[PDB]
Design a protein around this ligand. Structure first.
Ligand SMILES: CC(C)(C)n1nc(Oc2cccc(Cl)c2)c2c(N)ncnc21
Length: 454
């Protein structure tokens, strides 16, 4: 077999996506940069057999469209799959939108035409996405005229969805009703695209609720309206398209290809042109995006705290066992070995892909120490860092008026999206013995710590 770390070295962590971590990697010979998704066999089950995954990868590697992520290679070892593809540096679609002055039906139409164009093409090759959502739409580069690239086509056919709310944040808004009941086809991608279209034009989900299951109930019933005030600013042809895409019975639902010929797409994408800014839509999208990202950061922070506890004590156990004389001390070599040992047990950390990468992390930890218990504390704080800073930056972003505080109403929203229990979070707060009806960042962080057994 060919080995992933023989070819690629990891540069830096790009983020978390469906089914695993994504690393920026570089070919050790040619210097080609690529994005690598590392899927752990221990945390993600396969729905299909080997042969079927291989033939699907062999197909994906051959496909080519300007709105679909390019896949280059695939590797597999004892514990992991590695999907190697083209790296995109423009970030998520919605983050580019919320940093705009104007946004019109014209900008929406140009977004949606690209999305429908990639989808159309993948459906002709019998590949269905199933989990189409804003996070899966990346901008190819930081440029102004950059294409949208859809990531994760085909994956959900081969790998089972996580049940953890860490991993499901914001998926219920987009999912087709028929995917909930088991019988689904390519039309599920049109539904998801109509949900995204609805949000682009109103800033709000068509099927919404106070918690994950409430949202799913709305989706299953399938009723939505155009009753919000900002829909008055919207053409009727956009409403007609949305209706066709959010048609409940999939055989009555419009195809991706047919949707590219809809009058709204034709009208509003003319290079010619022939139109107001939907400022309310943009405000709500800015609010939506901050809420989703704060809830996502809250869960990852809590998850990272539990992992940190689990690995801190295990490393301590490994190093104690390694301590042959029992004096509490170890040299550079034992530290490396013990750290490696930790990763056989707990699986490879995305950013430690080989023995060389562990050494530099050790050597980095030592540079800040220049006694195995000081090493443990420093090495673990360095794995929490990204979580603790992501949380603070996510709290700062969500606090749009810079008041330094989040109200109880906003906590409800955040904890509902995070699917944490109304009575449970209210109880943690109380342990705010003074009821301002609001919390600053330190208090919010204490709430989360208390919701994960600290
Ligand atoms: C940063 C993240 C996790 C949203 N992401 N995901 C990406 O999607 C990937 C990246 C590698 C393999 C697969 Cl199957 C999907 C991605 C990319 N291609 N370029 C830059 N960032 C990427």
């Amino acid at each position: 077999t060919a080995i992933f770390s023989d070819r690629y070295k990891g540069q830096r962590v790009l983020g978390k996506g469906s089914f695993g971590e994504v690393i920026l990697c570089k070919d050790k010979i040619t210097g080609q940069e690529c994005a690598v998704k590392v899927i752990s066999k221990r945390q993600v089950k396969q729905k299909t057999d080997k042969e079927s995954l291989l033939r699907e990868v062999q197909l994906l590697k051959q496909l080519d469209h300007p709105n679909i992520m390019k896949l280059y290679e695939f590797f597999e070892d004892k514990g992991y799959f590695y999907l190697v593809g083209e790296v995109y540096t423009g970030g998520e679609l919605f983050d580019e939108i919320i940093s705009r002055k104007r946004f019109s039906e014209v900008d929406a139409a140009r977004i949606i035409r690209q999305v429908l164009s990639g989808i159309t093409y993948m459906h002709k090759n019998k590949i269905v996405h199933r989990d189409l959502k804003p996070e899966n739409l990346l901008l190819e580069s930081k440029s102004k005229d950059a294409n949208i690239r859809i990531i994760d086509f085909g994956l959900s056919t081969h790998f089972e969805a996580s049940k953890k709310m860490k991993d499901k944040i914001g998926t219920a808004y987009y999912i087709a009703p028929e995917v909930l009941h088991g019988t689904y086809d390519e039309k599920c991608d049109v539904w998801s695209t109509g949900v995204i279209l609805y949000i682009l034009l109103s800033g709000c989900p068509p099927f919404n609720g106070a918690n994950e299951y409430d949202i799913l109930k709305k989706v299953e019933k399938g009723k939505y309206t155009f009753e919000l005030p900002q829909w008055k600013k919207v053409s009727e042809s956009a409403k007609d398209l949305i209706r066709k895409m959010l048609t409940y019975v999939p055989s009555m639902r419009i195809s991706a290809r047919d949707a590219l010929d809809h009058e709204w797409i034709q009208t509003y994408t003319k290079e010619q042109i022939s139109v107001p800014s939907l400022d309310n839509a943009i405000l709500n999208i800015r609010q939506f995006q901050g809420t989703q990202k704060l809830a996502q950061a809250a869960l990852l922070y809590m998850g990272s705290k539990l992992t940190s506890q689990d690995e801190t004590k295990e490393l301590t156990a490994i190093f104690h066992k390694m301590d042959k004389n029992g004096d509490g001390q170890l040299d550079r070599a034992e530290l490396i070995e013990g750290y490696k040992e930790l990763m056989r047990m707990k699986g490879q950390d995305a950013s430690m892909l080989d023995a060389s990468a562990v050494e530099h992390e050790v050597d980095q930890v030592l540079d800040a120490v220049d006694e195995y218990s000081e090493f443990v504390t420093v090495a673990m704080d360095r794995k929490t860092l990204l979580s603790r800073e992501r949380l603070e930056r996510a709290f700062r972003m969500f606090d749009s008026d810079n008041s330094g505080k989040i109200s109880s109403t906003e906590l409800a929203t955040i904890f509902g999206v995070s699917d944490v229990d109304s009575e449970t979070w209210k109880s943690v707060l109380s342990e705010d013995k003074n009821n301002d009806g609001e919390v600053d960042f330190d208090e919010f962080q204490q709430m989360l710590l208390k919701l994960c057994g600290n």
